[PDB]
């Protein structure tokens, strides 16, 4: 039960980051813990490259990200 409580408490900032990512597409990961990174140079793009490179989910280590 204590481990569950600690997991919840540690996920709370991560769950806030997830909420912001899901609702606003805002990556709120301050330490790079979320699987998605935003490359703002392509996020400003107005083409397919905006979607593919502006925000990039770290796919190779999906288990780690």
């Amino acid at each position: 039960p204590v481990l569950l409580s600690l997991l919840k408490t540690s996920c709370e900032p991560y769950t806030r980051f997830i909420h912001d990512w899901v609702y606003s597409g805002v990556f709120r990961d301050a330490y790079g813990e979320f699987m998605i990174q935003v490359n703002h140079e392509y996020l400003s793009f107005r083409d397919k490259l905006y979607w593919t490179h502006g925000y990039v989910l770290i796919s190779k280590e999906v288990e780690d990200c």
């Binding site: 408490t9 709370e12 900032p13 806030r16």
Partner: protein, 133 residues
């Protein structure tokens, strides 16, 4: 010494455990002293209305702290305050004063004024996403 937090000297002949508990509680007094210096400095008109309002809001929490400390003094006069009880009861006050001292230090180091103060306050509020208090 300068814009540093107030440091305290404890009598060396005190019990090591007592002296260490005093040094654990003294951070509250160091934070209070830092907050009071920040409040007294940033309450100057030259610091702008946002910093004046911030100093007044901090002054309200310092007043609540003085109420708390007066309650701990009253309990001590009643003999109900042990060093371990003080340490437990001051944990929230220690955390609050540490947060206030961190904010005071950040405002003073950044010379934040107007929109920069609001930006700093927003970034601090986001930084406390895990601490509801």
């Amino acid at each position: 010494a300068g814009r540093q937090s107030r440091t305290f000297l404890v009598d060396p002949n005190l019990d090591l455990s007592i002296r260490e508990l005093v040094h654990r509680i003294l951070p509250v007094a160091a934070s209070y002293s830092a907050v009071t210096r920040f409040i007294e400095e940033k309450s100057s008109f030259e610091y702008g209305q946002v910093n004046h309002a911030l100093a007044a809001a901090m002054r309200t929490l310092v007043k609540e702290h003085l109420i708390l400390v007066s309650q701990l003094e009253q309990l001590h006069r009643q003999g109900l305050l042990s060093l371990q009880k003080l340490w437990f009861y001051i944990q929230p006050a220690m955390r609050t004063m540490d947060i206030l001292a961190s904010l005071a230090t950040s405002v003073d180091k950044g010379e934040c004024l107007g929109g920069s103060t609001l930006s700093l306050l927003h970034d601090r509020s986001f930084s406390y996403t895990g601490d509801s208090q």
